Amino acid sequence: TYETPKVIVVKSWTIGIINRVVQLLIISYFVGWVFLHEKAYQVRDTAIESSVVTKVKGSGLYANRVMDVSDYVTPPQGTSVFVIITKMIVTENQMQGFCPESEEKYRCVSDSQCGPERLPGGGILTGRCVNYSSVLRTCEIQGWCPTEVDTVETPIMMEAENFTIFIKNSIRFPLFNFEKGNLLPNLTARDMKTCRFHPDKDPFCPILRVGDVVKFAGQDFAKLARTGGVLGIKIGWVCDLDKAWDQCIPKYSFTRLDSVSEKSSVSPGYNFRFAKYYKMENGSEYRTLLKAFGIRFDVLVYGNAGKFNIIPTIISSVAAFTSVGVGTVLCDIILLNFLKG
Amino acid sequence: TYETPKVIVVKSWTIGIINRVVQLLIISYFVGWVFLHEKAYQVRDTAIESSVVTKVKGSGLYANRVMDVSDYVTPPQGTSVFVIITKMIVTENQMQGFCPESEEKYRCVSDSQCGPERLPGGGILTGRCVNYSSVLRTCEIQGWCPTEVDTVETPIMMEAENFTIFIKNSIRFPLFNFEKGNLLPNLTARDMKTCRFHPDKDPFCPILRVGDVVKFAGQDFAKLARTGGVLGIKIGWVCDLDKAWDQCIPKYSFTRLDSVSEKSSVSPGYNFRFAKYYKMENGSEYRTLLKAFGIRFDVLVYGNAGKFNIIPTIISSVAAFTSVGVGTVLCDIILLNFL
Amino acid sequence: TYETPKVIVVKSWTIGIINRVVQLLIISYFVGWVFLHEKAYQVRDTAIESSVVTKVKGSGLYANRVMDVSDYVTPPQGTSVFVIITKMIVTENQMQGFCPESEEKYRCVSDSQCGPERLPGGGILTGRCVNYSSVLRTCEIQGWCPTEVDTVETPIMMEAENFTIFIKNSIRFPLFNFEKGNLLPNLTARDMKTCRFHPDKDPFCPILRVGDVVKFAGQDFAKLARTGGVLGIKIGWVCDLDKAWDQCIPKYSFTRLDSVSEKSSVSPGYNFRFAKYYKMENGSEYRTLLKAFGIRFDVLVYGNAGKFNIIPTIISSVAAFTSVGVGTVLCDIILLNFLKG
């Protein structure tokens, strides 16, 4: 039971050429694009297990003091997100009590203006108008006193341009049981004493200089250090597991993540507050309040791998034979009207 | 050499109508579902690069003291996960030494009951029984003394309902080099001074009120503040790049994430311990231990975008043409067997 | 206006059995692989919403002191990632001033050797050279003094083997509106009082012991606690929503994540520094510096679910009928060449 349809042959006369040309065009597309370029003959994996450990080094001088890594890096646990502080405003010896507010927003002349109103922001309002200075009068509050003044101008820590960052990374593709890290076996204890990362002269040393990371992202240090920002470091593992074990290597990229802040005029940077707590010999308690500007780094990891396997080869190859057989038959029917016309 | 197979024509309009109806049905399905609704003529992109910066404001009174953002928020770095503390239990001036244990599950009547048997809790057992009070007798430990009492009832900080959260977000689609943030160009300082988020009256102000978030999640503040919980805030960027640049818009949603806690009866909330360390003029050291209940927020960002292209259009058009031809040929034999 | 092709039937004994066998094989492949093993008749969902809360308990002796959870666990907010400290090196009462260095990499003979040219990350090199001991001479710096000594040997805290970890997890599949947690409805306080996890004797108690986790990962505590490392805990929710509600359960797995460290000789572990700040009755400020080695745990959640629907069923059935119809038509042309040959 063949059950094969009948077919009639036609002398070419510039029609048989069209038969072979199209029959050869489609067989080109599968070999050229589906197999050789898109690599449809192998199984892909995109779920990657990763791990990042970081460490920073360097010292600087700021406000008649020396600051080391325990002073300007928060949080200290060496994770993949951390901040480097480049500018601070400091208020010393705050205690609980009553004091006048310092900002221009809280101006009053008599006791009536500020009571239960003006509720957004500000501590608890007592309900009196007092003299902040000779020419200014503001409403009294209850809280930590004295209040801070953040309108003055302070210098930045210029030495932070030379600090170094050390990144240690490990990956694993669970489907193929493949493991590698970014510390290559060619790295010796003597090399790490002097190497620095450079994208073409030394693409594998894990030590990055802070001033260069800002440079590769197209920014300016003297301006980013004064308002703060967020920078990203990306590591990519795109590997073909047929070739060899030592052809799998990482690639680094750099960019700036908080792109809205450059063009905005209502919120241009990045800052936060924190405090340190003390206690006297008596029970009294006081603290120190700091407002900090800085640059936030974070490391992002991605990748995928492929390896030859028999099952996707058969499935895609069968579709190739089906496509040419079906493709011609439909091309025959459309050519019947073309030949009839 | 076209080599077209022979074709037989059935003059019956009774079958011609069915042939035409089926062909129109198939072409209708392709032109309506694959193209217009599913938008198969454009290239998708789902890998989004994001960034979140937050800040909190407000003051309240608790235990005859005024507390502010450096007191009730932890960790202080302004990331996308943070906690607001609404209730505390405080133990003052702990030092190292020997003391009895306060809990009733450590009851004893002689030196023999508690030895190396029960390992955890407090510190290291010493092997003696001592009077905790006039009616209770637990057995002694070594560690920070005195131990904390956990069963008393403390009030919550009611003013935490009015605190405000400010969220700043930025995205980028690397395939199309598209960048936008949730601070629209219409925003000004005067608007910043008074706006508040509302899903229909003001859907774009970045300032959120805590009570409103708890309300939108469908919860009750007087219970969430007493047991603790986890709430989620979601921002979605689903926009089409063929239209104008000023119609890619964020959408906000709210929900509660630790849904098992309210059902369960063995662990109903969220709490933790932390301490503060001091030192005397002499070398001696002491500390203050705190157990804190609170609400945890975290911001989640997702999205995808598409843009018209040529290659998917060509592929889908060729698929439609070949499906028309193949669908006809099989239906030809189908009616050939039927009739 | 209907159309049909013409069919030729040849009742060859071999051809009939061949085409029936091939058609049966195609039907078998569709009914066995596509609809049964692969479950093509249902809709998938892989976006999962999760939440994790942890808590640790235990006490131990270390350097004539008793330590508890507020001392050995950082950070303290009970999130997915945390560290347990097993070894420390402590420097007491550091203050600002001038002092000589301690590391052997800073030796002198005369003042001219170490100046601005040698940048070692030292806070500053005042430019002199001073006696450190009776047989060593390094050159002076400015910063927190005295500097720390890093090469001595310290014991590890062995009681950390018996600490316990409590994990509370909640998931939700938004598509099907499905919610469940890892605290099963038949868990009581009395069971909570004494249960421990065991992969076959008790697979649902959420209390894990640290030594058991280290063993399941395939490691050795006596040296993991001495160098440091990173371990992973995985929870997987893979369940079918056609069955009963109480058949969706979690599965636990354990592994080590920083696999590059054990095979390397330039960076074998995981450590970091942090500090505690004090100040006297005067303004004088001093601190205590600690270098910590530990084990970092982190919890990873994943899963997917499926549920019966009608649209994928219709699509797959139509595809199966078309492939059967196309398969017969295509093969017979191919079989004609076999029949002709």
Ligand SMILES: C[C@@H](Nc1cc(N2CCN(C(N)=O)CC2)nc2nc(C3CC3)nn12)c1ccc2ccccc2c1
């Ligand atoms: C191969 C390409 N798309 C295509 C399909 C096609 N057909 C479908 C099969 N078929 C049948 N089952 O009878 C014959 C008709 N004909 C075509 N002709 C062309 C030439 C550019 C003009 N591309 N192309 C593809 C599809 C589906 C694929 C699915 C997974 C991975 C790769 C694919 C890759």
Ligand SMILES: C[C@@H](Nc1cc(N2CCN(C(N)=O)CC2)nc2nc(C3CC3)nn12)c1ccc2ccccc2c1
């Ligand atoms: C179009 C729809 N699935 C379908 C396929 C089909 N065939 C395969 C192609 N083909 C050939 N290559 O000869 C003819 C036979 N015939 C059909 N008939 C129907 C009507 C509902 C009843 N849906 N449908 C699809 C598939 C694959 C798709 C792949 C990517 C994106 C969208 C797709 C969308």
Ligand SMILES: C[C@@H](Nc1cc(N2CCN(C(N)=O)CC2)nc2nc(C3CC3)nn12)c1ccc2ccccc2c1
């Ligand atoms: C079924 C299998 N792949 C296959 C396709 C095929 N085509 C279909 C279109 N078609 C048409 N439109 O005429 C006839 C030609 N023919 C085939 N023959 C074989 C032989 C067993 C090796 N596998 N196989 C598949 C495809 C597409 C699928 C899409 C989604 C999920 C599962 C799929 C699973």
Ligand SMILES: Nc1ncnc2c1ncn2[C@@H]1O[C@H](COP(=O)(O)OP(=O)(O)OP(=O)(O)O)[C@@H](O)[C@H]1O
């Ligand atoms: N949680 C909040 N509630 C109300 N207003 C806020 C909040 N956070 C920020 N703002 C307002 O948004 C504007 C931009 O904030 P920005 O990040 O620039 O703070 P800043 O101006 O650097 O310092 P400050 O905290 O004193 O405003 C500020 O004018 C501030 O008043």
Ligand SMILES: Nc1ncnc2c1ncn2[C@@H]1O[C@H](COP(=O)(O)OP(=O)(O)OP(=O)(O)O)[C@@H](O)[C@H]1O
């Ligand atoms: N790591 C752990 N090891 C052993 N038991 C634990 C652990 N964590 C919690 N539990 C027990 O689980 C129960 C539920 O704890 P929950 O999260 O409600 O904290 P809690 O009731 O405040 O416990 P505690 O008062 O001990 O902090 C408690 O009875 C506690 O004893």
Ligand SMILES: Nc1ncnc2c1ncn2[C@@H]1O[C@H](COP(=O)(O)OP(=O)(O)OP(=O)(O)O)[C@@H](O)[C@H]1O
């Ligand atoms: N940011 C950095 N800049 C320069 N060198 C670094 C940096 N981080 C680490 N190293 C060097 O890498 C080597 C391996 O680091 P690792 O942290 O494992 O050693 P370590 O014993 O902690 O060193 P150290 O005691 O100096 O911190 C060390 O010799 C260290 O000097």
Ligand SMILES: *[C@@H]1O[C@H](CO)[C@@H](O)[C@H](O)[C@H]1NC(C)=O
């Ligand atoms: C950092 O090092 C450079 C030399 O590489 C030096 O010129 C510069 O002064 C240093 N940075 C600062 C701001 O001191």
Ligand SMILES: *[C@@H]1O[C@H](CO)[C@@H](O)[C@H](O)[C@H]1NC(C)=O
């Ligand atoms: C080590 O191998 C890498 C990758 O092949 C190579 O780029 C590098 O130069 C090698 N290093 C040495 C010192 O041979």
Ligand SMILES: *[C@@H]1O[C@H](CO)[C@@H](O)[C@H](O)[C@H]1NC(C)=O
């Ligand atoms: C405690 O003593 C300090 C001086 O050491 C004094 O300033 C303070 O007012 C006293 N506090 C109280 C509550 O008496």
Ligand SMILES: *[C@@H]1O[C@H](CO)[C@@H](O)[C@H](O)[C@H]1NC(C)=O
């Ligand atoms: C918050 O402000 C409202 C007025 O807007 C006030 O009525 C309310 O009492 C405040 N919250 C609390 C709990 O005090």
Ligand SMILES: *[C@@H]1O[C@H](CO)[C@@H](O)[C@H](O)[C@H]1NC(C)=O
């Ligand atoms: C700013 O632009 C958005 C559209 O991007 C618009 O919906 C909004 O109303 C504008 N702002 C105001 C305050 O009108």
Ligand SMILES: *[C@@H]1O[C@H](CO)[C@@H](O)[C@H](O)[C@H]1NC(C)=O
């Ligand atoms: C140190 O002095 C304090 C009083 O200031 C005293 O209580 C303590 O016992 C002394 N230290 C020790 C270890 O005895």
Ligand SMILES: *[C@@H]1O[C@H](CO)[C@@H](O)[C@H](O)[C@H]1NC(C)=O
């Ligand atoms: C933990 O408890 C076991 C008994 O269950 C005990 O033998 C062991 O010594 C304890 N751990 C350590 C290292 O002390």
Ligand SMILES: *[C@@H]1O[C@H](CO)[C@@H](O)[C@H](O)[C@H]1NC(C)=O
């Ligand atoms: C609780 O139910 C599970 C099945 O959901 C069962 O395996 C387990 O044995 C039950 N608990 C006990 C203590 O038997």
Ligand SMILES: *[C@@H]1O[C@H](CO)[C@@H](O)[C@H](O)[C@H]1NC(C)=O
């Ligand atoms: C305060 O006293 C300490 C000693 O306790 C001394 O070192 C310091 O110089 C004094 N500070 C002032 C400002 O006199």
Ligand SMILES: [Mg+2]
């Ligand atoms: Mg300000």
